[PDB]
Amino acid sequence: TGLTDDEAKEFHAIFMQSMYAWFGLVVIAHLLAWLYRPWL
Amino acid sequence: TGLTDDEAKEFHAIFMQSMYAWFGLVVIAHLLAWLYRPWL
Amino acid sequence: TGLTDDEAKEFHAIFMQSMYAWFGLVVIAHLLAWLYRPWL
Amino acid sequence: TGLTDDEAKEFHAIFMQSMYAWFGLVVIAHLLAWLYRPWL
Amino acid sequence: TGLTDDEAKEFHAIFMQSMYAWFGLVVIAHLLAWLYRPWL
Amino acid sequence: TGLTDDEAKEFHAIFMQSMYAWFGLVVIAHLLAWLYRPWL
Amino acid sequence: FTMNANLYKIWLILDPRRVLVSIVAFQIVLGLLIHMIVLSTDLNWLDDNIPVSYQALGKK
Amino acid sequence: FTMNANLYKIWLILDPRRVLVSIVAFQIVLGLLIHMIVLSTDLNWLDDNIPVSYQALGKK
Amino acid sequence: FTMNANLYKIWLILDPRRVLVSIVAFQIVLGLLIHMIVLSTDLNWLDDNIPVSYQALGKK
Amino acid sequence: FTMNANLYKIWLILDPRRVLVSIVAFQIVLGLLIHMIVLSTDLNWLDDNIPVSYQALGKK
Amino acid sequence: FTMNANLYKIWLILDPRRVLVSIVAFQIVLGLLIHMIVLSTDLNWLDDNIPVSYQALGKK
Amino acid sequence: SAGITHYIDAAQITIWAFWLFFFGLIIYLRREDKREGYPLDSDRTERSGGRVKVVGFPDLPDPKTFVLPHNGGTVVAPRVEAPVAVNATPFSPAPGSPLVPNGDPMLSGFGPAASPDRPKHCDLTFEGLPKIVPMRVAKEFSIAEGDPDPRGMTVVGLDGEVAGTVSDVWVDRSEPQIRYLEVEVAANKKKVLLPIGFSRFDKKARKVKVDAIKAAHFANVPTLSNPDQVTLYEEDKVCAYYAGGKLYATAERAGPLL
Amino acid sequence: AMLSFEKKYRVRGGTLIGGDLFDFWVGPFYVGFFGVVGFCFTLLGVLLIVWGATIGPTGPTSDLQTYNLWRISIAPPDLSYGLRMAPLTEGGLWQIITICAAGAFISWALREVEICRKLGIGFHVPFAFSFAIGAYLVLVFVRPLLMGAWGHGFPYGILSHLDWVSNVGYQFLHFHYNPAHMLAISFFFTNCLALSMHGSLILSVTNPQKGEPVKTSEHENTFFRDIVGYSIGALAIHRLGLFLALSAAFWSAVCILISGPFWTRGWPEWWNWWLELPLW
Amino acid sequence: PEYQNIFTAVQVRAPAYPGVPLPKGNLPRIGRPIFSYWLGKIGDAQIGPIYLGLTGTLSIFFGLVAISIIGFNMLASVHWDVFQFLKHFFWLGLEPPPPQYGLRIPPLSEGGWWLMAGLFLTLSILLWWVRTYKRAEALGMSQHLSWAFAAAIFFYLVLGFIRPVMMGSWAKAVPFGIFPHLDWTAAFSIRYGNLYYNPFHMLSIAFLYGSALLFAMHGATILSVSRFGGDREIDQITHRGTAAERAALFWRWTMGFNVTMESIHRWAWWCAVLTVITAGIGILLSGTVVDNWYLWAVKHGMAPAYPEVVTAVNPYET
Ligand code: BCL
Ligand code: BCL
Ligand code: BCL
């Protein structure tokens, strides 16, 4: 898969953080959205 | 299928835990959904 | 089908028990379903 | 991508502040738009 | 690609002032346009 | 690229006044046009 | 699970990978099919107003 | 141990990369599908006016 | 256990570049899709005329 | 400005030339689209008679 | 402290001739474009009957 | 006021978007169109010594590299190709005038007989065995049940005269079919290739007509640097010769008719 | 100007007519005697469509006169004129423009022919072209003749001719039931399919994934054999596509040839022969 | 006289080809080949083997289910009289849920078979999509087909699912029947005031005509340069020959410009994908955006005016 075993630790580290960051952005947007106009 | 017996036990192990985690998320959704909105 | 007589003992053993497990689940779903909403 | 590790710090730095520059210009124009004409 | 680091500082310079000249001509045009015929 | 540094001075020089000769014919015609037929 | 013959020999006859793919497929098709048939019948369990009505608890 | 006590062997028979990515696709589509299914029944949550009709709030 | 513990190894299995760009598309399209879903339902936020209507804002 | 810190390594994976041009395109396009969205809604600013009607500057 | 101070190097990555010609065309097109956009809406400046009606070289 | 009909509807602007995407598409396709034959040949270029390389609108696209499989090479497009003299002379010195072939028209290698210089290597099977080889090199091949075996038919030219006889059949090892007929020529018993495209069968007579050239011309068929395989260079070379005969092989194909 | 490999083929001779008289090039176009006849036919044709646009159906000052491209339209004479030449300003013009169009397409075809003779290539293209020329002729020559009047031809205007198609189509009530129409439509659709498949293929093999080399004939056959258990092969796919598109043109020509001259009733009614066989 | 390369006049056989080999993961191939002297009369005589994976099996599976609902339903409409079924088959069809139901999942007897057949058909087409992307990857190739199939899928989806959902009514999708679906087409144009004045449908028509034009031209070309092995387009693309030269020149001398062995395949490719893509856009704006295209054309001044020589008084206005 043309990576080394260490750059699957590294990449993974970066990935986890970035995705969790996006998810942060999303949960933020939806709580605000719930605030202005709840859908459930 | 180019794998050794250790890399299908290992694969199976991680697969099983990952799969169970997703499935966990599933029952989570089904409980929130069941409380605010029962279907049965 | 390129098998020796022994991996037709093994594949068959695992196949058979797994299928009976699936059949088990089915029996489960049909009993749950029969209790909550009879169609008969 | 035929880059060295030092020359992707560079691209990243310039890219990031510039990208953020655009984000700014947009936040400005959108506040201007918001003042002159609210959509929510 | 294939400029010296010096002739793209130069190129960037001339590009920048020239582009700004264009923006000037346009803002000229937009202000007259705003004057003869308000649109907002 | 396929000119000397002296004949793009020469070319540019001849070019600009030629261009303005054109701009002149135009602003003239538009003056004529504006006099017989004002539009705003 | 009570003896049968030499009915393991089926795997000297039928490729285990293909039977696997076939069962996975067929079972998936049948699953969706019956679910939609039941959803297309009187026995529907969704558009029933079960257990509390949803189109008149918000259009009002 | 009466249970599939060698069921790791499946990853000796079926290519895991394929199976995994395949599974992801399958779940994303089924998710999409049933989402539309719920959207087509009494259980809908969008064309509902929940919690207050917006097509008739507004001043104006 | 809720924990993965060896899931860095997934990139020993799946091309990271491809996985990344794949996610980019799937997210940008899904964004477009659902945006369009909300724009077509009661929860709409553009054609509301809230808090003041612009399409009947002039007498002229 | 990443915001910290080895997220520069991302240009070790995705060609900077390609990412740049891609974004340029995506934005140059999206702009046109949303512009059109605004042109068909409450936020329209051209065929409004704003701030004074222009086809009623004479007749037609 | 920031970093928009190495923003000339763009001409080491993106061909200047190309960027120039691109911007040139893109602009001429955008111009023709917008002109037509406004010309199809109320802000029109051709069919306004301004400042002296010409089909009014009579009783029109 | 709830009726202000807008003159602009989504249909207008979708027709606008379309035309813009269109123009960019057209332009782009014309760029892939100049990966060969360009820049053009004028005496605009020669007069200016070359300072006017002719490319038109749009312009030429950055080269693209084809990586041939099997230690084969690498090709680029657009490329810089070495000029090659024209084996003919201007019918008129005025530009746009056609040229007359020099010498014996079938030999000229000008006109319907012209052809480029393709590699002097062979096209290969997937495996890497000479794709086009004779049935004598390709053991497996076999006529299809119910088809006259060409092997042994008489090859006959355009005027009637016997030309030779089918000594073998060349086949595609990649897409199994008859590509070339082999011809033991009568006048010198040398073996030549004959493209299938030039050959008509007369199954009831076991003849293989050839309108292309005269029976005699078969003597000058361009030759193979090995009787058990053929190179890309040699195929063009073989065919173009026969093709020349379509305008040359007779003192009448030159046209007119009136 | 010439391609970087063109001079070596620009031979003298090969005409049908003209010989050295018009045996020359202009830019990249070949002239030839038929390029001259063609250009003349063409130029007069277009210049007359310009005059028709200039005059309009009721005179240059009336409101129906127009230079708008969607609406300029030159229509045939009324049926009252039959096969006679009708006055110029009453569809005569349309007749002459038609004669010019037929002559121009035929010159064009013959000039492609001289070009095959020069280059020494098969004449598959102008033969194939001749199918479009044929369809055009049934739509202006054959049908209106069989129908005793030239007015049955379609008008030359971008949308007005679409209107011709529409009302002619509707005289038979539900044209879709025209069986030749059903054929021609089938070919037009399938042609569009094979073309997308060939197109896709060539481009999928000569440019494969990075890390892979130009692909092979073996790949080609293996992919479509993988997908649909069959591959018609490289030569033949070029053969099929030619078959589909020429046939699509054919059946369009016949489907319109039978709509009038050989069938007057609605088209669905044609299918009656099937409901009445003595089987049911 | 000269062979036209229409009919292979003398064929040859060789042991069948199982094909270029696939990587691990890509399952075995099935079936073992045969030759048809007659396919052979015009093309590769080899028939199969075929590839069938999870994808391929789930697609053949869904697709045949969908084919059964449509068919069985048609036999039901004639009372299980296979004779009558045979007699009116062309006219038989499975109509869509009625409007009364909106987008709700309807009862078996009122449209539910259509929604199920529509459902299963779509899943099966999109599975065949995935199939061609897999089969195209196993060969290292590119997804050019998949980008086209994806376009035709686009039109399909616009026709039977997207426009319907947008219009809030399953009755707006197309019914499964030959004559029924022809009628659906005509009614569609009628309902929205003549589709001829729909710009997108005009473009789609220019592009359908263009697929016939380009493939006929190119195809005739490749045959005319078949003599020089122009059919062997791959190597004429890597290593230009006199076939690609005579080819580019025929057109150059004819219409003043030309393309290349590689680029014609792009003009053709792009022209086909365009048909379906204008086409789908065309159905997308109907009812969603425009309700009467002729009127639309008048509002944009595109509809021609003819002297009104025949006219009728409006009773609704008396
Ligand atoms: C909407 C109401 C107003 C309107 C308001 C505006 C406004 C507002 C603007 C214009 C502007 C423009 N208008 Mg106006 N305009 C109207 C009516 C008209 C009419 C008409 C028939 O009535 C015309 C012909 C025009 C014409 C135009 C163009 C002259 C100009 C846009 C430049 C451009 O797009 O090119 C593309 C431009 C460039 C690529 C950069 C310019 C450089 C030139 C093209 C040289 C290119 C460089 C090239 C490499 C050659 C090198 C040169 C030498 C090296 C020196 N307007 C209506 C009446 N118009 C715009 C402008 O800037 O003009 C001042 C502008 O902002
Ligand atoms: C009409 C009466 C009941 C109904 C009665 C039943 C009955 C009875 C059964 C199901 C079964 C299924 N039902 Mg139910 N079900 C109803 C309402 C629902 C609803 C809903 C939105 O309301 C949903 C989402 C489902 C969903 C499901 C699936 C989770 C499940 C497995 C079949 C399958 O995967 O198909 C396609 C895929 C396959 C068939 C896979 C075959 C492949 C391998 C061999 C099996 C592995 C599958 C997977 C691991 C099993 C997942 C679920 C496990 C049981 C926990 N049901 C209605 C209300 N349902 C079945 C089940 O539970 O499993 C026993 C079953 O027998
Ligand atoms: C009633 C509905 C609400 C609504 C509620 C929400 C909610 C709720 C959400 C959004 C979110 C989004 N909304 Mg909203 N939204 C509404 C009205 C609008 C309007 C409008 C015309 O009015 C617009 C333009 C938008 C626009 C958008 C997008 C900005 C955004 C989704 C991004 C995406 O697709 O992922 C694709 C984008 C990315 C993957 C990130 C871009 C990454 C760049 C290219 C990478 C830079 C390089 C990087 C530093 C290093 C490389 C990293 C890797 C490449 C990743 N909304 C209305 C008001 N909107 C979503 C959001 O916030 O984002 C999640 C969200 O959760």
Ligand code: BCL
């Ligand atoms: C009106 C409603 C009826 C109907 C009525 C008709 C009628 C009536 C006709 C068709 C015709 C046809 N219809 Mg219909 N048709 C219906 C619905 C459809 C549908 C559909 C999805 O519903 C489809 C796909 C079609 C498609 C078709 C084809 C089967 C056929 C047109 C091809 C053709 O003529 O080739 C022929 C191609 C040519 C004639 C072009 C020839 C080119 C010439 C030689 C050169 C042109 C040169 C020119 C100068 C080029 C310009 C270049 C400039 C120099 C730059 N119809 C509807 C239901 N249809 C027409 C037909 O049958 O064809 C005769 C016909 O008469």
Ligand code: BCL
């Ligand atoms: C009835 C009179 C109306 C008419 C109404 C319509 C309508 C309505 C439509 C067209 C459509 C089109 N019309 Mg029309 N059309 C008219 C007259 C014409 C004329 C002519 C000469 O007059 C022509 C040339 C055309 C031309 C065409 C084509 C250009 C275009 C569709 C291309 C196509 O095949 O898509 C078809 C290709 C596909 C649908 C994709 C196929 C792929 C699918 C997924 C294959 C799956 C295969 C399946 C799984 C295999 C198993 C089988 C199962 C049993 C199902 N029309 C007149 C004006 N026309 C389209 C359009 O314009 O919309 C704006 C359309 O939908």
Ligand SMILES: CC[C@H]1c2cc3[nH]c4c(c3C)C(=O)[C@H](C(=O)OC)c4c3nc(cc4[nH]c(cc(n2)[C@@H]1C)c(C(C)=O)c4C)[C@@H](C)[C@@H]3CCC(=O)OC/C=C(\C)CCC[C@H](C)CCC[C@H](C)CCCC(C)C
């Ligand atoms: C027969 C199968 C398909 C086909 C094949 C085909 N067409 C061909 C060829 C081939 C093989 C050529 O080699 C030849 C060509 O040059 O390739 C583009 C041609 C051709 N395909 C063209 C047209 C064409 N083919 C079409 C269709 C078809 N042609 C079928 C799809 C269509 C349509 C309706 O779909 C058109 C419009 C031309 C670009 C070209 C031939 C060009 C030509 O002959 O030029 C000489 C004539 C002029 C330049 C104009 C003459 C001036 C006239 C007096 C004025 C116009 C009068 C006209 C009757 C008015 C109609 C107005 C319309 C708006 C209604």
Ligand SMILES: CC[C@H]1c2cc3[nH]c4c(c3C)C(=O)[C@H](C(=O)OC)c4c3nc(cc4[nH]c(cc(n2)[C@@H]1C)c(C(C)=O)c4C)[C@@H](C)[C@@H]3CCC(=O)OC/C=C(\C)CCC[C@H](C)CCC[C@H](C)CCCC(C)C
């Ligand atoms: C540029 C747009 C054109 C286009 C493109 C296009 N079409 C395409 C593609 C593309 C790019 C594909 O990739 C795909 C293809 O596979 O190409 C050959 C396809 C396709 N084009 C086809 C149809 C099609 N496309 C059409 C149109 C068009 N498609 C446009 C002209 C048309 C029209 C309108 O005329 C049709 C009819 C299909 C062959 C194919 C999609 C096939 C598919 O999706 O399959 C779905 C399901 C089935 C076929 C069910 C399987 C039934 C089996 C045939 C029976 C075998 C049974 C066996 C005996 C097993 C045992 C059974 C057991 C259950 C007992």
Ligand SMILES: CC(C)=CCC/C(C)=C/CC/C(C)=C\CC/C(C)=C\CC/C(C)=C/CC/C(C)=C/CC/C(C)=C/CC/C(C)=C/CC1=C(C)C(=O)c2ccccc2C1=O
């Ligand atoms: C007073 C007086 C003297 C008048 C002045 C004269 C004037 C006005 C001068 C202007 C001159 C100019 C500007 C132009 C002349 C105009 C002429 C005569 C008319 C053009 C007619 C013409 C046929 C135009 C048609 C244009 C179009 C789009 C045609 C459709 C065909 C198509 C889609 C085109 C692109 C694709 C092409 C060309 C493919 C051909 C092609 C194919 C098909 C292959 O298979 C192949 C295989 C291997 C190598 C190459 C090729 C290849 O080139």
Ligand SMILES: COC1=C(OC)C(=O)C(C/C=C(\C)CC/C=C(\C)CC/C=C(\C)CC/C=C(\C)CC/C=C(\C)CC/C=C(\C)CC/C=C(\C)CCC=C(C)C)=C(C)C1=O
């Ligand atoms: C590299 O090249 C490529 C390959 O090679 C490897 C491929 O294999 C492939 C894969 C291609 C395939 C597997 C091809 C599949 C073919 C398809 C989908 C086309 C479908 C066509 C049909 C089902 C046939 C329909 C037609 C019939 C059944 C016969 C009909 C007979 C009729 C109507 C009566 C005959 C008479 C007429 C039509 C009237 C007269 C005819 C004319 C005037 C036309 C003239 C034709 C010629 C050829 C000169 C591709 C894409 C490729 O690009």
Ligand SMILES: COC(C)(C)C/C=C/C(C)=C/C=C/C(C)=C/C=C/C(C)=C/C=C\C=C(C)\C=C\C=C(C)\C=C\C=C(C)\C=C\CC(C)(C)OC
């Ligand atoms: C006796 O016969 C035996 C063998 C049993 C079987 C014979 C069968 C036969 C002969 C069948 C013949 C069938 C024919 C000829 C069918 C013809 C069909 C045609 C010509 C159709 C033409 C157009 C149809 C279209 C465009 C249909 C489009 C429908 C769509 C796109 C439906 C989409 C539906 C979806 C995706 C469903 C979603 C469900 C959700 C999830 C939303 O529900 C909650």
Ligand SMILES: [Fe+3]
């Ligand atoms: Fe081709």
Ligand SMILES: [Sr+2]
């Ligand atoms: Sr609800």
Ligand SMILES: [Sr+2]
């Ligand atoms: Sr609202």
Ligand SMILES: [Sr+2]
């Ligand atoms: Sr407003």
Ligand SMILES: [Sr+2]
């Ligand atoms: Sr005005």
Ligand SMILES: [Sr+2]
């Ligand atoms: Sr005036």
Ligand SMILES: [Sr+2]
């Ligand atoms: Sr006038």
Ligand SMILES: [Sr+2]
């Ligand atoms: Sr009877």
